[PDB]
Amino acid sequence: SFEAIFGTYCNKIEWVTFLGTALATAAHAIMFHDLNKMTTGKMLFYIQVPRVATGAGIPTSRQTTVMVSKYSEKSPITIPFEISAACLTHLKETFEDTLLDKLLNADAVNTVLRAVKNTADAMERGLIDTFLRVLLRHAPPCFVL
């Protein structure tokens, strides 16, 4: 008699990106590199108002000028991954190799690549999440709007 393990299958993950979704059609997405070096990004909006006035008793206003300095909002994300010290040992040792070292070493390479790979997937997803949560926290309910 025998146990007969069949085809050892695997998933391969759904390769999402926030540009690839429809969130970046609402997100003007900009890489910037001194963002750890910046504090709070200001924006000046210069705004004229119109000046329609008439009448004899009606209070005619002055020309009114409005600048508003609307601020940015930091909201960093951080996902953890981890690579085992056994994985680092079977990478950095690379000992007297009778092919069970080489299988294990290629496994360690694929382990680190798989972990960083899924980590970047998590990075994309987390950017999806915090962009969505910022839209929710700065989007009123539409009965209010």
């Binding site: 998933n11 085992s84 294990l104 496994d107």
Partner: protein
């Protein structure tokens, strides 16, 4: 032997779920599973 899965190669396939992958083992879509969060050093012990 889950090491024989996670160490040997596999087959990239499209999968499907009713609810959720970690709920698939807690609400038990399948029994005799294996779940692990930190990358296992046991598969490195041959």
């Amino acid at each position: 032997n889950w090491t024989a899965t996670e160490l040997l190669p596999k087959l990239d396939v499209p999968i499907d779920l009713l609810t959720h992958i970690k709920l698939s083992v807690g609400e038990e879509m399948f029994n005799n599973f294996r779940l692990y969060y930190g990358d296992d050093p046991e598969r490195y012990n041959l």
